[PDB]
Amino acid sequence: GQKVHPNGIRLGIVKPWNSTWFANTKEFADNLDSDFKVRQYLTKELAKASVSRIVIER
Amino acid sequence: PVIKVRENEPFDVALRRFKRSCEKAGVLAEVRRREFYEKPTTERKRAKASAVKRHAKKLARENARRTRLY
Amino acid sequence: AKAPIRARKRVRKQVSDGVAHIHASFNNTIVTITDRQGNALGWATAGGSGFRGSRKSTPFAAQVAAERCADAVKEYGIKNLEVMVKGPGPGRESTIRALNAAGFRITNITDVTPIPHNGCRPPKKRRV
Amino acid sequence: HTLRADIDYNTSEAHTTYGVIGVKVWIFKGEILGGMAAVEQPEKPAAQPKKQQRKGRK
Amino acid sequence: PRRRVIGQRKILPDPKFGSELLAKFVNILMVDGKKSTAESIVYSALETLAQRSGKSELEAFEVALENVRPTVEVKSRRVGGSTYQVPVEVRPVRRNALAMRWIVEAARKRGDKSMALRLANELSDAAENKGTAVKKREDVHRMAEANKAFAHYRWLSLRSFSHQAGASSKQPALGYLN
RNA sequence: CUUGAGUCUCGUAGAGGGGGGUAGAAUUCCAGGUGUAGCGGUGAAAUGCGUAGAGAUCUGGAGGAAUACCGGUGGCGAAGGCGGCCCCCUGGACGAAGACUGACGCUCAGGUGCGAAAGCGUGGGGAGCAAACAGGAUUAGAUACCCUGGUAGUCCACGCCGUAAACGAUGUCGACUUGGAGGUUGUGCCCUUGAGGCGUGGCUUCCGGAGCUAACGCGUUAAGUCGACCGCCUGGGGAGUACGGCCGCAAGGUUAAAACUCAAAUGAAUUGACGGGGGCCCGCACAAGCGGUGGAGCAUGUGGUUUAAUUCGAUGCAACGCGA
RNA sequence: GGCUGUCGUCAGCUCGUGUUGUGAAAUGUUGGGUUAAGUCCCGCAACGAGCGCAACCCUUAUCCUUUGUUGCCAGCGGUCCGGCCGGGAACUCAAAGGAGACUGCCAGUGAUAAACUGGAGGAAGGUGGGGAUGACGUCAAGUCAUCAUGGCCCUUACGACCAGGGCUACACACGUGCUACAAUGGCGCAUACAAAGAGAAGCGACCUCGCGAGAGCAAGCGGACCUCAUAAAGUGCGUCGUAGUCCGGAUUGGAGUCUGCAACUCGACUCCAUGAAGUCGGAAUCGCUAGUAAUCGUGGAUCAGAAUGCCACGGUGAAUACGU
RNA sequence: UGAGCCUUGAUGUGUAGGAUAGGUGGGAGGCUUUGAAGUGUGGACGCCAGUCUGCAUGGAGCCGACCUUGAAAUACCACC
């Protein structure tokens, strides 16, 4: 079961990132963990709809 | 088995092709080997047997003209 | 055995022509220089080159055997040569070069390797 | 092993009676896709019309 | 193996004299990557040599590189129940380097109170064919005259050879059916 | 009757059978000549032979199995079987004209005759090689294999039970089924334009069509279409032994089985692996090289080993500065 | 389940479809020539097409192009000759569009040919250097300890707070890396230029104390301005001879310092004195085709307190690749 | 052909040493074409080409006392 993940090397050109924001190093973890919490608890609410992607921007 | 028939022009290297006609074969070839009585008729006498690979080759020449490989 | 002799000048009978005999086995060559009338004037071997194994039975050991004996007989004063060959083993040609390199002519390379009229039965060896 | 265009991969995780099941799905829409593309201009034509410096002279 | 022909690097004249034949010498004089020292050791040796004979600083270096030069090599490639040795005549790039290696191999044990002197003594010596690497030459050609006996899995190779427009005799050389 | 077959003389190819004659070459041997330090064996090696003169080599004689050469897809026999050259006795098959008989035919239990090979009794013969046997070598085990010593045997003559994979494991003989060509021969014809061409027989063989096979293969010499008659087989293991009849101085031979166990065994082919069968290709896989760790000291991980416990994960390449 | 490793950069593997066999399955996926290539010339029941590779891609190298500072400075000014500053654009130089190179040209070779090599301008001729980059998937490889999770057990606990102790143990062996065993160096004194990145919770010039580490104060910062940082190896001069030294400097005593209630086994740093093993190491044992290998130092990721390690960077930079 | 007795003749390729180490006395060198040596000719003579060396011609050298290495020292004649 081979290969570095196929979409992962594509993330810098003609594929967008799944999230786009910037925090100046020291606050980057605090912003990354909140960016996860919005992913996890928001999708729980829209359970009954059908959705392909989630894109969070600050 | 430098073979008693003399090579055309004598030189330090014996011309083994030009020398043999029926020497060493069957008589002095199976040295330190088990002697059979009737196996040699089919075992050693393989002149028809060795011609077949040459025939196979001479057949495939023609087919290479017809395929346009040639 | 050999002695530490001063440089050689010596004369014996100055016979000028000889026959050589090469007895080729699987493990060795015995190379033996004779008078035309047929008398040992000297010999050397492949086995005293002390290679052991299969390695004693190679054309280069056949060459140097020829070169020792052909050398020694320069005191016997041979100047031309003929050889009889007796075995199916290697040094077919490289033995012939050492007799020529001793500065002798070697025009008659008579193989006499004897084919009996179906003689005595050989050891059976491997069952293939 | 392609770097160019977006190309869609998903690995699903889902449950059934006997435990977790999963499907790995690559789908390929096109080798040129315009859904994310590089910016309209290079630096050299962009922004101010008179761009050359005084080259000192405070 | 090897699909196509693959090349070699080329040495570009050294920064303190301007010679290719010197920039290749300093490359094997290198210990711990340090060519910029191996330069300092060549030029300090060469000048001591230059007091010994003033007609050229390169006198005793240039003739060392001819006299201790091996002309022949012995190669090795195992066959089954046997290792053997099989002689080849050697290509010039390795004739030159063997001799450069051997001048420096001998120098680092000369024990003299500066390496510039160690290298300068072994060159004055190998120029006159009196030094340490005359022996290294002698041995390497002995092996190449002695090992003319052997062939590669020989007993079957000797028919295989005879039909491939080869001789009725054992070829003492690498990677041929012999 | 001839449409089956049988017969007389003529011709032809061949190692068919049985008894006689006959030369030369190695080992082996006796004698004589020449000559000095190893020979032999094998992966490597030892046992074996040698300075008491080996080993090798030359000259002359010796003896016996055997006949190296016909050597090719040839030809002959009975399958197995047959190879030096001649002579004597003589079989069987292949041709051809002249000619004759006229179902005189097919098959064959029983049957009598008859051996590849070794086994084998007496006589003859005996040179090498060799089961066993012995010892080395292997450790890989049986004194086996493998190597060296080494015997019966192998070899002929007559004689005893005729064994097997006993052969195209293709019964016998006969009728029918597109052919060309090889090898090579009777014989009709040809400048025999090339082991050539055609007419028509001969064994022997390559190719392939109808038909026949599970598959390879066979294919006019069938394993096709068939004919009669005979021979033999009916799951494995255990059994080519046991049992009965019968033969053999004698060791042995001959047809040839069940209880019981058991759900399989067996012909073949695909593809991987694999060959110690043959060959090709590629990777820093080797070569062509250079440096690095093991050893020192330290740093760190692993296990050994320790306690209350010194926690686990990874362990041939897919492990140890790696999950941690 | 999600995910990844092995083979292996093997150079092959598969989808759609026909045909040949009764079918398992072949064929293509095999051949000749050629390669990094199922790349490309030729061609048979393989036709059509995809996967790996090839490519786009980022980066680097010159170099085209715009900016002109916290960047640069042929010339000019204060001037230690530092862009600190009056000023200046000849010039790297930085982040960004990217340019160039395609066996396309020309020649030789190769079956036309892919392609190998040579020519030439250019930094560079052979998909320019470097990376990304990994077929279907057996190996039942490994994680229930990222996490999903059925089966399935405790839930006064296979939960929790608090503390101490351990893997960092010692009889040893072994895997790895470091640095060394010299003089190519080390000693003393003098001497030179880095790249890249870190510094918002943080670091930090000058400061005064201190042998240093550090101390306590603090302008300043947003990092091409200030600082980590003296980059080291390398060079200069004079000096050293196998004696474990003039290499190597470990240990250990002792004092100063640090992060923290708390430094004992188990923490860091400075530094004084004395001063060992080890002279390239048996068995074992690995990466490498060139910016590589080797070797030297740096910073950062992590980061209470601790790097030999990992990641990247720059210094200095190797033998050879005949041949299968 | 052993042994005894006896006439002369030599090699000594050392760890350290330029090479020439059987024990050891005489004893401080032979200048004779330089004792030489040297291509070249022969001879004693061996851990195999090495020590010594006769001589047309050759004033070119063993090698010590010395110079030098070692436990012992070396010329050259003897003794064995």
Residue to substitute from A7, A9, A15, interface D, most D β-carbons within 10 A:
A15
Residues in chain A, overall count: 58
Nearest to C44 by CA among C111, C102, C107: C102
User: Nearest nucleotide by C1' from C4 CA?
Assistant: H48
Length C64 CA → F35 C1' (Å): 21
CB contact (8 A) between residue C60 and residue E169: no
Is the shortest CB-to-strand distance from C65 to strand F under 7 Å? no
Q: Give me E26's structure tokens.
A: 């300093």
Is the shortest CB-to-strand distance from C115 to strand F under 7 Å? yes
How many Å apart are CA E96 and CA E66, to the nearest integer?
A: 8
Residues 6+ apart with CB under 8 A from E112: E118, E121
How many Å apart are CA E177 and CA C63, to the nearest integer?
A: 22
What are the chain E neighbours of B13 within 8 Å (beta carbons)? 167-169
Is the shortest CB-to-strand distance from C117 to strand H under 7 Å? no
The residue type at E39:
E
The CATH number linked to E122 is 1.10.455.10
Q: Contact at 8 Å (CB) between C113 and C86?
A: yes
* DSSP secondary structure, C26-63, as one string: SS-EEEEEEETT--EEEEEESGGG---SGGGSSHHHHH
How many Å apart are CA D24 and CA D10, to the nearest integer?
A: 6
Chain E interface residues (partner B, CB cutoff 8 A): 162, 167-169
Write the burial class of residue B59 (CB in 10 Å: 0-12 exposed, 13-18 middle, 19+ buried): exposed
Give me the long-range contacts of B60-69 (CB less than 8 A, separation at least 24).
none
Distances (CA, A) of E17 to C72, E26, E157: 59, 12, 53
Dihedral sign of CA atoms B19, B22, B26, B27 in order: negative
DSSP strand pairing (D14-16 vs C78-86): unpaired
CB contact (8 A) between residue B10 and residue C111: no
Q: Contact at 8 Å (CB) between E160 and E177?
A: yes
How many Å apart are CA E171 and CA E177, to the nearest integer?
A: 8
User: Nearest nucleotide by C1' from E101 CA?
Assistant: G319
CB contact (8 A) between residue D4 and residue A9: no
E122-142 per-residue burial string, b: 16 or more CB within 10 A, e: under 16? bbbbbbeeebbbeebbeebee
Q: Chain E contact for B13, CB < 8 A?
A: yes
Distances (CA, A) of E131 to C90, E119, E128, E137: 42, 12, 8, 11
User: Nearest nucleotide by C1' from E41 CA?
Assistant: G184
SS (H, E, C) chain A: CCCCCCCCCCCCCCCCCCEECCCCCCCHHHHHHHHHHHHHHHHHHCCCCCCCCCCEEC
What are the chain B neighbours of E164 within 8 Å (beta carbons)? none
Number of C to E CB contacts under 8 A, please give it. Answer: 21
How many Å apart are CA B40 and CA C45, to the nearest integer?
A: 36
Q: At what angle do helices E115-127 and E92-107 cross, to 10 degrees?
A: 130
Distances (CA, A) of C57 to C24, C71, C92, E87: 9, 21, 11, 18
Please count the other Cβ atoms lying within 10 Å of the Cβ belonging to residue A15. 20
How many Å apart are CA D3 and CA E117, to the nearest integer?
A: 60
How many Å apart are CA C44 and CA C30, to the nearest integer?
A: 7
Q: Give me D47's structure tokens.
A: 């922004």
- G chain positions with any atom within 7 Å of a protein CB: 1-8, 31, 34-37, 42-44, 52-58, 65-69, 85-89, 95-98, 115-118, 132-137, 139, 141-142, 148-150, 180, 182-185, 198-201, 233-236, 239-242, 289-290, 293-296, 315-324
> Which residues share a beta bridge with C120?
none
B32-47 per-residue burial string, b: 16 or more CB within 10 A, e: under 16? eeeeeeeeeeeeeeee
> Which residues share a beta bridge with D57?
none
SS (H, E, C) chain E: CCCCCCCCCCCCCCCCCCCHHHHHHHHHCCCCCCHHHHHHHHHHHHHHHHHHCCCCCCHHHHHHHHHCCCCEEEECCCECCECCCEEEECCHHHHHHHHHHHHHHHHCCCCCCCHHHHHHHHHHHHHCCCCCCHHHHHHHHHHHHHHHHCCCCHHHHHHHHHHCCCCCCCCCCCCCCC
**Segment holding C64, helix H or strand E:** helix C59-72
The residue type at E147:
N
Please count the other Cβ atoms lying within 10 Å of the Cβ belonging to residue E47. 12
Residues 6+ apart with CB under 8 A from E77: E84, E86, E152, E174, E175
Is the shortest CB-to-strand distance from C4 to strand H under 7 Å? yes
Q: Contact at 8 Å (CB) between E101 and E70?
A: no
The residue type at E28:
I
Distance spanning both ends of chain D, measured CA to CA: 54
Q: Contact at 8 Å (CB) between E155 and E80?
A: no
Nearest to E123 by CA among E95, E103, E97: E103
Distances (CA, A) of A40 to A30, A45, A47: 16, 10, 11
Distances (CA, A) of E144 to A43, C40, D47, E163: 80, 34, 77, 28
Strand order in the sheet with C29-35: C40-45, C29-35, C16-24, C78-86, C109-111
C100-116 per-residue burial string, b: 16 or more CB within 10 A, e: under 16? bebebebeebebebeee
Nearest to E50 by CA among E100, E115, E120, E110: E120
Radius of gyration of the CA atoms of chain D, in A: 25
**Residue B59, helix vs strand vs coil:** helix
Please count the other Cβ atoms lying within 10 Å of the Cβ belonging to residue E74. 18
CB contact (8 A) between residue C124 and residue B31: no
Length A35 CA → F223 C1' (Å): 84
Q: Contact at 8 Å (CB) between B14 and C109?
A: yes
Length B48 CA → F95 C1' (Å): 29
Dihedral sign of CA atoms C77, C81, C86, C87 in order: positive
E108: domain range? Answer: 20-143
- F chain positions with any atom within 7 Å of a protein CB: 15, 23-27, 33-45, 55-59, 64-74, 80-83, 116-117, 127-130, 145-148, 154, 278-290
Is the shortest CB-to-strand distance from C110 to strand F under 7 Å? no
Is the shortest CB-to-strand distance from C124 to strand H under 7 Å? no
User: Nearest nucleotide by C1' from B28 CA?
Assistant: F68
Q: Using what technique was this structure determined? A: cryo-EM
Nearest to E38 by CA among E59, E15, E60: E15
How many Å apart are CA D2 and CA D26, to the nearest integer?
A: 13
